[PDB]
Coordinates of C-alpha atoms and ligand atoms in Angstrom, one line a residue:
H1 CA -100.5 -39.1 -70.3
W2 CA -100.2 -35.8 -71.9
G3 CA -97.5 -33.3 -70.8
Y4 CA -94.7 -30.8 -72.1
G5 CA -92.0 -33.5 -72.0
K6 CA -90.1 -35.0 -75.2
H7 CA -92.3 -38.2 -75.0
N8 CA -95.4 -36.6 -74.5
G9 CA -94.8 -32.9 -75.1
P10 CA -97.8 -30.4 -77.7
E11 CA -96.7 -32.5 -80.7
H12 CA -97.6 -35.8 -79.8
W13 CA -100.8 -34.4 -78.4
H14 CA -103.3 -34.7 -81.7
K15 CA -102.5 -38.7 -81.4
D16 CA -105.2 -38.2 -78.6
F17 CA -106.7 -34.9 -79.3
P18 CA -107.1 -34.3 -83.1
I19 CA -108.8 -31.4 -83.0
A20 CA -105.1 -30.2 -81.9
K21 CA -105.1 -30.5 -86.2
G22 CA -107.6 -27.7 -85.5
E23 CA -108.9 -24.4 -87.7
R24 CA -108.7 -22.7 -84.4
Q25 CA -106.0 -23.6 -82.0
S26 CA -104.1 -21.2 -79.4
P27 CA -101.4 -19.6 -79.2
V28 CA -101.2 -17.6 -82.2
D29 CA -98.4 -15.0 -82.7
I30 CA -99.9 -11.9 -83.0
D31 CA -98.4 -9.5 -85.8
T32 CA -99.1 -6.2 -84.8
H33 CA -98.7 -4.8 -88.3
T34 CA -101.4 -7.1 -89.7
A35 CA -103.8 -6.7 -86.3
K36 CA -106.8 -4.6 -87.6
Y37 CA -107.9 -2.2 -85.3
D38 CA -111.6 -2.1 -85.1
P39 CA -113.2 1.0 -83.3
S40 CA -116.8 -0.8 -83.0
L41 CA -114.3 -3.1 -80.1
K42 CA -115.6 -1.6 -76.8
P43 CA -113.7 -1.2 -73.7
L44 CA -113.2 -3.8 -71.1
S45 CA -115.1 -4.0 -68.0
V46 CA -113.3 -6.1 -65.6
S47 CA -115.6 -6.0 -62.3
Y48 CA -113.4 -7.7 -59.8
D49 CA -114.4 -5.7 -56.7
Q50 CA -116.5 -8.5 -55.1
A51 CA -114.0 -12.0 -56.1
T52 CA -114.0 -14.8 -53.6
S53 CA -110.8 -16.8 -53.9
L54 CA -111.1 -20.2 -52.6
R55 CA -108.2 -22.1 -53.1
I56 CA -104.7 -22.7 -54.9
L57 CA -104.1 -26.1 -56.5
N58 CA -101.3 -28.1 -58.2
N59 CA -102.9 -29.4 -60.9
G60 CA -99.8 -31.4 -62.3
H61 CA -99.2 -28.8 -65.5
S62 CA -99.1 -25.6 -63.7
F63 CA -100.7 -24.2 -60.7
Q64 CA -104.1 -22.6 -60.1
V65 CA -106.5 -20.0 -58.0
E66 CA -110.2 -20.9 -58.0
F67 CA -113.0 -18.7 -57.2
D68 CA -116.4 -18.7 -56.1
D69 CA -118.6 -18.5 -59.4
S70 CA -121.9 -19.3 -57.9
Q71 CA -123.0 -16.0 -58.5
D72 CA -122.2 -13.0 -60.6
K73 CA -119.3 -11.9 -58.2
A74 CA -116.1 -11.5 -60.4
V75 CA -117.1 -10.7 -63.8
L76 CA -115.9 -9.8 -67.5
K77 CA -117.7 -7.8 -69.8
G78 CA -117.6 -5.1 -72.7
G79 CA -114.9 -6.2 -75.1
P80 CA -115.9 -8.1 -78.0
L81 CA -118.2 -10.0 -75.6
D82 CA -121.6 -10.8 -75.8
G83 CA -123.5 -11.5 -72.1
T84 CA -122.0 -11.6 -68.9
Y85 CA -118.5 -14.1 -68.1
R86 CA -117.7 -15.2 -64.3
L87 CA -114.4 -15.7 -63.4
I88 CA -114.1 -19.3 -62.2
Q89 CA -109.9 -19.2 -62.5
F90 CA -106.9 -18.1 -63.3
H91 CA -103.2 -19.9 -63.8
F92 CA -99.7 -19.1 -65.3
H93 CA -97.1 -20.8 -68.1
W94 CA -93.6 -20.0 -67.2
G95 CA -90.3 -21.0 -69.2
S96 CA -87.2 -22.3 -67.8
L97 CA -85.3 -19.2 -69.0
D98 CA -86.4 -15.3 -69.0
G99 CA -86.8 -15.3 -72.6
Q100 CA -89.4 -18.0 -72.8
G101 CA -92.8 -19.2 -71.1
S102 CA -95.5 -17.1 -72.6
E103 CA -97.6 -19.2 -75.0
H104 CA -98.9 -15.8 -77.2
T105 CA -95.8 -14.3 -78.9
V106 CA -95.5 -10.5 -80.2
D107 CA -94.0 -9.9 -83.4
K108 CA -92.6 -13.5 -82.6
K109 CA -91.7 -12.2 -79.1
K110 CA -91.7 -14.3 -76.0
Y111 CA -92.0 -13.0 -72.7
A112 CA -91.5 -14.7 -69.3
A113 CA -94.6 -15.8 -68.5
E114 CA -98.1 -15.3 -69.4
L115 CA -101.3 -15.4 -66.6
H116 CA -104.6 -16.7 -67.6
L117 CA -107.8 -15.7 -66.2
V118 CA -110.5 -18.3 -67.3
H119 CA -113.9 -16.9 -67.2
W120 CA -117.5 -19.1 -68.6
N121 CA -120.5 -17.7 -70.9
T122 CA -122.9 -17.6 -67.8
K123 CA -126.0 -17.9 -70.5
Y124 CA -124.8 -22.0 -70.2
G125 CA -125.7 -22.3 -66.7
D126 CA -122.4 -24.3 -66.1
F127 CA -118.9 -24.6 -66.9
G128 CA -119.3 -27.7 -67.9
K129 CA -122.3 -26.2 -70.5
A130 CA -120.4 -23.3 -71.3
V131 CA -117.0 -25.3 -72.6
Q132 CA -119.3 -27.4 -75.1
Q133 CA -120.0 -23.5 -77.1
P134 CA -118.4 -21.5 -79.4
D135 CA -118.9 -18.3 -77.1
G136 CA -118.5 -20.2 -74.0
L137 CA -115.4 -19.3 -72.5
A138 CA -113.4 -16.2 -72.4
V139 CA -109.7 -15.6 -71.7
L140 CA -107.5 -12.8 -70.5
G141 CA -104.0 -13.2 -71.2
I142 CA -101.3 -11.0 -69.8
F143 CA -97.7 -11.1 -70.1
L144 CA -95.2 -11.1 -67.5
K145 CA -92.1 -9.6 -67.8
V146 CA -88.9 -9.8 -65.8
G147 CA -88.2 -6.2 -63.6
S148 CA -89.7 -5.0 -60.5
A149 CA -91.3 -6.9 -58.3
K150 CA -95.4 -7.0 -58.4
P151 CA -96.2 -6.4 -54.9
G152 CA -99.7 -8.0 -56.1
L153 CA -98.3 -11.5 -56.8
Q154 CA -96.4 -12.1 -53.5
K155 CA -99.2 -13.4 -51.4
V156 CA -99.4 -16.6 -54.0
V157 CA -95.3 -16.6 -54.6
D158 CA -95.4 -17.0 -50.9
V159 CA -97.8 -20.2 -50.8
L160 CA -96.0 -21.9 -53.6
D161 CA -94.1 -23.9 -51.1
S162 CA -97.0 -25.5 -49.5
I163 CA -98.6 -27.0 -53.1
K164 CA -94.9 -28.2 -54.8
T165 CA -96.6 -31.5 -56.0
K166 CA -99.3 -32.3 -58.2
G167 CA -102.3 -33.1 -56.5
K168 CA -101.3 -30.8 -53.1
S169 CA -104.0 -27.7 -52.4
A170 CA -103.9 -25.1 -49.8
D171 CA -106.8 -22.2 -48.7
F172 CA -106.2 -19.5 -50.4
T173 CA -108.9 -16.8 -49.2
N174 CA -109.0 -13.1 -49.6
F175 CA -106.9 -12.7 -52.9
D176 CA -107.7 -9.9 -55.2
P177 CA -107.2 -10.6 -58.5
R178 CA -106.9 -6.4 -58.9
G179 CA -103.2 -6.5 -57.7
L180 CA -102.6 -8.6 -60.8
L181 CA -103.5 -6.0 -63.9
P182 CA -101.4 -4.0 -65.9
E183 CA -102.4 0.1 -66.1
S184 CA -103.9 -0.2 -69.5
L185 CA -106.7 -2.5 -70.5
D186 CA -106.3 -2.2 -74.5
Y187 CA -106.3 -5.5 -76.2
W188 CA -106.0 -7.6 -78.9
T189 CA -108.7 -10.2 -79.3
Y190 CA -109.1 -13.5 -81.6
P191 CA -111.3 -16.9 -81.3
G192 CA -109.5 -19.2 -80.4
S193 CA -109.0 -22.4 -78.0
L194 CA -108.1 -23.9 -74.7
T195 CA -103.9 -24.1 -74.9
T196 CA -104.1 -27.6 -73.2
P197 CA -105.7 -30.6 -73.7
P198 CA -108.7 -31.3 -74.3
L199 CA -108.0 -28.3 -76.5
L200 CA -111.7 -27.4 -77.2
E201 CA -112.1 -24.6 -79.7
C202 CA -114.4 -22.9 -77.1
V203 CA -112.4 -19.4 -76.5
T204 CA -112.5 -16.0 -77.1
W205 CA -109.2 -14.5 -76.7
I206 CA -108.2 -11.4 -75.6
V207 CA -105.0 -10.7 -74.7
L208 CA -103.8 -7.1 -73.0
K209 CA -101.3 -5.2 -74.7
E210 CA -99.0 -4.0 -71.9
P211 CA -97.3 -6.6 -70.0
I212 CA -97.0 -6.8 -66.1
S213 CA -93.6 -6.7 -64.3
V214 CA -92.1 -9.8 -62.2
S215 CA -88.9 -9.6 -60.1
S216 CA -86.0 -12.4 -60.8
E217 CA -86.9 -13.7 -57.6
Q218 CA -90.9 -13.5 -57.9
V219 CA -90.4 -16.2 -61.3
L220 CA -87.7 -17.8 -59.7
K221 CA -90.3 -19.4 -57.1
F222 CA -92.3 -20.4 -60.1
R223 CA -89.3 -22.7 -61.3
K224 CA -89.2 -24.7 -58.3
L225 CA -93.1 -26.4 -58.7
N226 CA -93.0 -29.7 -59.9
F227 CA -95.1 -32.1 -62.4
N228 CA -94.8 -34.9 -60.6
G229 CA -96.6 -36.3 -57.3
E230 CA -95.3 -36.5 -53.6
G231 CA -92.8 -39.6 -53.9
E232 CA -92.4 -39.8 -57.0
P233 CA -88.9 -38.4 -58.5
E234 CA -88.7 -34.9 -59.0
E235 CA -89.4 -33.4 -62.4
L236 CA -89.3 -29.7 -62.2
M237 CA -92.5 -27.4 -63.4
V238 CA -91.1 -25.4 -66.4
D239 CA -92.1 -24.6 -69.7
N240 CA -95.4 -25.5 -69.4
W241 CA -96.4 -23.5 -72.5
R242 CA -97.7 -24.2 -75.9
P243 CA -96.3 -23.0 -79.3
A244 CA -97.5 -20.6 -81.6
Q245 CA -99.8 -22.7 -83.9
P246 CA -101.1 -21.2 -87.2
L247 CA -103.7 -18.7 -87.7
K248 CA -105.4 -20.1 -90.4
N249 CA -108.9 -17.9 -91.5
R250 CA -109.0 -16.1 -88.6
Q251 CA -107.9 -12.1 -87.9
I252 CA -106.5 -10.4 -84.7
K253 CA -108.8 -7.3 -84.0
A254 CA -106.8 -4.3 -81.8
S255 CA -108.7 -2.3 -79.9
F256 CA -106.3 0.8 -80.1
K257 CA -105.4 2.7 -82.7
Ligands
D8W301 N1 -104.4 -22.0 -70.8 S1 -105.8 -22.1 -70.6 O1 -106.6 -22.7 -72.4 O2 -106.7 -21.2 -70.0 C1 -107.0 -23.4 -69.9 N2 -106.1 -24.2 -70.0 N3 -106.5 -25.2 -69.0 C2 -107.5 -24.7 -68.4 N4 -108.5 -25.5 -67.8 S2 -109.9 -25.4 -67.2 O3 -110.4 -24.1 -68.2 O4 -110.1 -25.4 -65.8 C3 -110.8 -26.9 -68.0 C4 -111.1 -28.0 -67.1 C5 -111.7 -28.9 -67.6 C6 -112.0 -28.2 -69.7 C7 -112.0 -27.4 -70.2 C8 -111.4 -26.2 -69.3 S3 -108.2 -23.5 -69.5
ZN302 ZN1 -103.6 -20.5 -70.0

Protein backbone atom coordinates (compact mmCIF):
# COMPACT_ATOMS: atom_id res chain seq x y z
CA HIS A 1 0.00 0.00 0.00
CA TRP A 2 1.06 3.62 -0.44
CA GLY A 3 2.79 5.67 2.22
CA TYR A 4 5.78 7.96 2.76
CA GLY A 5 8.68 5.52 2.98
CA LYS A 6 11.39 4.71 0.45
CA HIS A 7 9.60 1.83 -1.22
CA ASN A 8 6.04 3.23 -1.23
CA GLY A 9 6.44 7.05 -1.06
CA PRO A 10 5.28 9.84 -3.38
CA GLU A 11 7.62 8.89 -6.25
CA HIS A 12 5.90 5.51 -6.44
CA TRP A 13 2.25 6.62 -6.27
CA HIS A 14 1.79 7.04 -10.00
CA LYS A 15 1.97 3.27 -10.57
CA ASP A 16 -1.30 2.77 -8.72
CA PHE A 17 -2.66 6.34 -9.28
CA PRO A 18 -1.61 7.59 -12.72
CA ILE A 19 -3.32 10.95 -12.14
CA ALA A 20 -0.29 11.66 -9.92
CA LYS A 21 1.27 12.85 -13.20
CA GLY A 22 -1.87 14.94 -13.88
CA GLU A 23 -2.27 18.57 -15.06
CA ARG A 24 -3.49 20.04 -11.80
CA GLN A 25 -1.65 18.25 -9.01
CA SER A 26 -0.93 19.61 -5.54
CA PRO A 27 0.95 20.81 -3.61
CA VAL A 28 2.90 23.53 -5.48
CA ASP A 29 5.48 26.16 -4.71
CA ILE A 30 3.96 29.61 -4.39
CA ASP A 31 6.24 32.11 -6.13
CA THR A 32 5.17 35.37 -4.54
CA HIS A 33 6.58 37.44 -7.41
CA THR A 34 4.53 35.74 -10.12
CA ALA A 35 1.28 35.27 -8.25
CA LYS A 36 -1.32 37.64 -9.71
CA TYR A 37 -3.21 40.02 -7.50
CA ASP A 38 -6.88 39.63 -8.38
CA PRO A 39 -8.99 42.51 -6.99
CA SER A 40 -12.05 40.58 -8.21
CA LEU A 41 -11.47 37.99 -5.46
CA LYS A 42 -13.80 38.27 -2.49
CA PRO A 43 -12.83 38.12 1.17
CA LEU A 44 -13.16 34.69 2.69
CA SER A 45 -16.20 34.05 4.86
CA VAL A 46 -15.46 31.49 7.61
CA SER A 47 -18.51 30.68 9.70
CA TYR A 48 -17.43 28.13 12.31
CA ASP A 49 -19.49 29.42 15.21
CA GLN A 50 -21.77 26.39 15.14
CA ALA A 51 -19.12 23.72 14.39
CA THR A 52 -19.63 20.33 15.97
CA SER A 53 -16.55 18.13 16.30
CA LEU A 54 -17.17 14.40 16.85
CA ARG A 55 -13.96 12.45 17.07
CA ILE A 56 -10.25 12.34 16.35
CA LEU A 57 -8.70 9.47 14.44
CA ASN A 58 -5.25 8.12 13.50
CA ASN A 59 -5.84 7.04 9.90
CA GLY A 60 -2.36 5.60 9.40
CA HIS A 61 -1.00 8.56 7.40
CA SER A 62 -2.00 11.52 9.59
CA PHE A 63 -4.57 12.23 12.29
CA GLN A 64 -7.86 13.91 11.51
CA VAL A 65 -10.53 15.65 13.59
CA GLU A 66 -14.02 15.00 12.16
CA PHE A 67 -17.10 17.23 12.23
CA ASP A 68 -20.84 16.68 11.86
CA ASP A 69 -21.57 17.79 8.30
CA SER A 70 -25.23 16.69 8.18
CA GLN A 71 -26.30 20.33 8.09
CA ASP A 72 -24.83 23.79 7.32
CA LYS A 73 -23.14 24.18 10.75
CA ALA A 74 -19.55 25.06 9.87
CA VAL A 75 -19.14 26.44 6.37
CA LEU A 76 -16.78 28.33 4.10
CA LYS A 77 -17.90 30.71 1.43
CA GLY A 78 -16.69 33.79 -0.37
CA GLY A 79 -13.13 34.00 -1.69
CA PRO A 80 -12.98 32.30 -5.12
CA LEU A 81 -15.81 29.95 -4.27
CA ASP A 82 -19.31 29.74 -5.60
CA GLY A 83 -21.67 28.25 -3.14
CA THR A 84 -21.43 26.82 0.33
CA TYR A 85 -18.77 24.39 1.42
CA ARG A 86 -19.23 22.35 4.60
CA LEU A 87 -16.30 21.51 6.91
CA ILE A 88 -15.95 17.75 7.27
CA GLN A 89 -12.47 17.28 8.78
CA PHE A 90 -9.07 18.86 9.43
CA HIS A 91 -5.68 17.15 9.58
CA PHE A 92 -1.99 18.01 9.53
CA HIS A 93 1.21 17.23 7.62
CA TRP A 94 4.53 17.67 9.47
CA GLY A 95 8.25 16.93 9.31
CA SER A 96 10.92 15.13 11.26
CA LEU A 97 12.77 18.46 11.65
CA ASP A 98 11.53 22.02 12.14
CA GLY A 99 12.78 23.02 8.69
CA GLN A 100 10.39 20.80 6.76
CA GLY A 101 6.88 19.41 7.00
CA SER A 102 4.66 21.72 4.97
CA GLU A 103 3.31 20.60 1.61
CA HIS A 104 2.97 23.98 -0.04
CA THR A 105 6.12 26.14 -0.05
CA VAL A 106 6.42 29.89 -0.42
CA ASP A 107 9.33 31.02 -2.61
CA LYS A 108 10.71 27.50 -1.83
CA LYS A 109 10.49 28.14 1.93
CA LYS A 110 9.22 25.10 3.88
CA TYR A 111 7.33 25.46 7.19
CA ALA A 112 7.30 23.05 10.13
CA ALA A 113 3.82 21.78 9.34
CA GLU A 114 0.64 22.46 7.40
CA LEU A 115 -2.96 22.36 8.57
CA HIS A 116 -5.67 21.41 6.06
CA LEU A 117 -9.34 22.16 6.69
CA VAL A 118 -11.33 20.15 4.17
CA HIS A 119 -14.76 21.33 2.98
CA TRP A 120 -17.14 19.99 0.36
CA ASN A 121 -19.58 21.72 -1.97
CA THR A 122 -23.10 21.04 -0.74
CA LYS A 123 -24.62 21.31 -4.12
CA TYR A 124 -23.41 17.76 -4.80
CA GLY A 125 -25.37 16.34 -1.85
CA ASP A 126 -22.65 14.18 -0.28
CA PHE A 127 -18.87 14.10 0.02
CA GLY A 128 -18.45 11.04 -2.15
CA LYS A 129 -20.21 12.85 -5.02
CA ALA A 130 -18.34 16.09 -4.39
CA VAL A 131 -14.90 14.47 -4.85
CA GLN A 132 -15.83 13.55 -8.39
CA GLN A 133 -16.33 17.20 -9.41
CA PRO A 134 -13.71 19.78 -10.39
CA ASP A 135 -15.22 22.24 -7.91
CA GLY A 136 -16.16 19.67 -5.33
CA LEU A 137 -13.72 20.41 -2.49
CA ALA A 138 -12.20 23.51 -0.95
CA VAL A 139 -9.25 23.03 1.36
CA LEU A 140 -8.01 25.86 3.59
CA GLY A 141 -4.23 25.51 4.10
CA ILE A 142 -2.54 27.13 7.09
CA PHE A 143 1.21 27.10 7.70
CA LEU A 144 2.71 26.36 11.13
CA LYS A 145 6.00 27.82 12.20
CA VAL A 146 7.86 27.07 15.41
CA GLY A 147 7.80 29.91 17.97
CA SER A 148 5.28 30.55 20.76
CA ALA A 149 2.62 27.99 21.66
CA LYS A 150 -0.87 28.14 20.21
CA PRO A 151 -3.31 27.76 23.11
CA GLY A 152 -6.10 26.69 20.78
CA LEU A 153 -4.06 23.67 19.62
CA GLN A 154 -3.28 22.23 23.03
CA LYS A 155 -6.58 20.28 23.34
CA VAL A 156 -5.52 18.42 20.20
CA VAL A 157 -1.95 17.85 21.37
CA ASP A 158 -3.07 16.43 24.71
CA VAL A 159 -5.25 13.69 23.20
CA LEU A 160 -2.66 12.31 20.78
CA ASP A 161 -1.59 9.85 23.45
CA SER A 162 -4.89 8.04 23.02
CA ILE A 163 -4.66 7.52 19.25
CA LYS A 164 -1.00 6.61 18.97
CA THR A 165 -1.39 3.90 16.34
CA LYS A 166 -3.30 3.46 13.10
CA GLY A 167 -7.02 2.87 13.42
CA LYS A 168 -7.31 4.26 16.97
CA SER A 169 -10.03 6.88 17.53
CA ALA A 170 -11.29 8.94 20.44
CA ASP A 171 -14.35 11.06 21.25
CA PHE A 172 -13.40 14.69 20.59
CA THR A 173 -16.40 16.95 21.14
CA ASN A 174 -16.77 20.68 21.64
CA PHE A 175 -13.51 21.53 19.82
CA ASP A 176 -13.67 25.04 18.31
CA PRO A 177 -11.61 25.31 15.11
CA ARG A 178 -11.66 29.12 15.29
CA GLY A 179 -8.74 28.79 17.70
CA LEU A 180 -6.51 27.62 14.83
CA LEU A 181 -6.93 30.64 12.49
CA PRO A 182 -4.38 33.42 11.96
CA GLU A 183 -5.38 37.03 12.49
CA SER A 184 -5.46 37.84 8.76
CA LEU A 185 -7.46 35.93 6.12
CA ASP A 186 -5.39 37.10 3.15
CA TYR A 187 -4.78 34.20 0.74
CA TRP A 188 -3.46 32.67 -2.43
CA THR A 189 -5.71 30.36 -4.48
CA TYR A 190 -5.25 27.91 -7.36
CA PRO A 191 -7.05 24.83 -8.68
CA GLY A 192 -5.40 21.60 -7.55
CA SER A 193 -5.79 18.12 -6.20
CA LEU A 194 -5.81 15.98 -3.06
CA THR A 195 -2.21 15.56 -1.97
CA THR A 196 -2.69 11.91 -0.96
CA PRO A 197 -4.08 9.01 -3.02
CA PRO A 198 -6.46 8.95 -4.80
CA LEU A 199 -5.04 12.40 -5.78
CA LEU A 200 -8.31 13.47 -7.35
CA GLU A 201 -8.24 16.82 -9.12
CA CYS A 202 -11.31 18.18 -7.34
CA VAL A 203 -9.85 20.86 -5.02
CA THR A 204 -9.90 24.63 -4.95
CA TRP A 205 -6.92 25.43 -2.73
CA ILE A 206 -7.02 28.47 -0.46
CA VAL A 207 -3.65 28.95 1.25
CA LEU A 208 -3.44 31.65 3.95
CA LYS A 209 -0.50 34.01 3.79
CA GLU A 210 -0.12 34.36 7.54
CA PRO A 211 1.30 31.35 9.44
CA ILE A 212 0.25 30.43 12.94
CA SER A 213 2.98 29.78 15.45
CA VAL A 214 3.24 26.66 17.60
CA SER A 215 5.80 25.70 20.18
CA SER A 216 8.60 23.21 19.77
CA GLU A 217 6.92 21.12 22.43
CA GLN A 218 3.60 21.06 20.56
CA VAL A 219 5.02 19.86 17.24
CA LEU A 220 7.20 17.38 19.16
CA LYS A 221 4.06 15.57 20.25
CA PHE A 222 2.99 15.18 16.62
CA ARG A 223 6.20 13.32 15.93
CA LYS A 224 5.45 10.67 18.55
CA LEU A 225 2.53 9.24 16.59
CA ASN A 226 2.92 5.99 14.67
CA PHE A 227 2.13 4.99 11.10
CA ASN A 228 1.81 1.39 12.19
CA GLY A 229 -1.02 -0.35 14.02
CA GLU A 230 -0.80 -1.64 17.60
CA GLY A 231 1.35 -4.75 17.93
CA GLU A 232 3.36 -3.90 14.81
CA PRO A 233 6.95 -2.67 14.72
CA GLU A 234 7.12 1.03 15.53
CA GLU A 235 7.38 3.52 12.69
CA LEU A 236 7.18 7.16 13.75
CA MET A 237 4.68 9.29 11.90
CA VAL A 238 6.93 12.00 10.45
CA ASP A 239 7.48 13.55 7.00
CA ASN A 240 3.97 12.76 5.82
CA TRP A 241 4.13 15.48 3.16
CA ARG A 242 4.18 15.31 -0.64
CA PRO A 243 6.77 17.36 -2.52
CA ALA A 244 5.82 20.30 -4.71
CA GLN A 245 4.42 19.35 -8.13
CA PRO A 246 4.80 21.21 -11.44
CA LEU A 247 2.46 24.20 -11.85
CA LYS A 248 1.91 23.44 -15.59
CA ASN A 249 -0.82 25.58 -17.12
CA ARG A 250 -2.09 27.23 -13.92
CA GLN A 251 -1.90 30.69 -12.40
CA ILE A 252 -1.81 31.33 -8.68
CA LYS A 253 -4.00 34.30 -7.70
CA ALA A 254 -3.55 36.48 -4.61
CA SER A 255 -6.24 38.28 -2.65
CA PHE A 256 -3.87 40.98 -1.52
CA LYS A 257 -1.66 43.59 -3.18
N1 LIG B 1 -4.15 16.65 2.05
S1 LIG B 1 -5.63 16.80 1.46
O1 LIG B 1 -5.54 17.04 0.05
O2 LIG B 1 -6.34 17.81 2.14
C1 LIG B 1 -6.41 15.35 1.64
N2 LIG B 1 -5.79 14.14 1.64
N3 LIG B 1 -6.66 13.10 2.07
C2 LIG B 1 -7.90 13.55 2.37
N4 LIG B 1 -8.92 12.78 2.82
S2 LIG B 1 -10.40 12.97 2.64
O3 LIG B 1 -10.86 14.30 2.21
O4 LIG B 1 -11.11 12.54 3.86
C3 LIG B 1 -10.83 11.99 1.43
C4 LIG B 1 -11.14 10.66 1.69
C5 LIG B 1 -11.52 9.84 0.63
C6 LIG B 1 -11.58 10.37 -0.65
C7 LIG B 1 -11.28 11.71 -0.90
C8 LIG B 1 -10.91 12.53 0.16
S3 LIG B 1 -8.05 15.25 2.15
ZN1 LIG C 1 -3.67 17.39 3.75
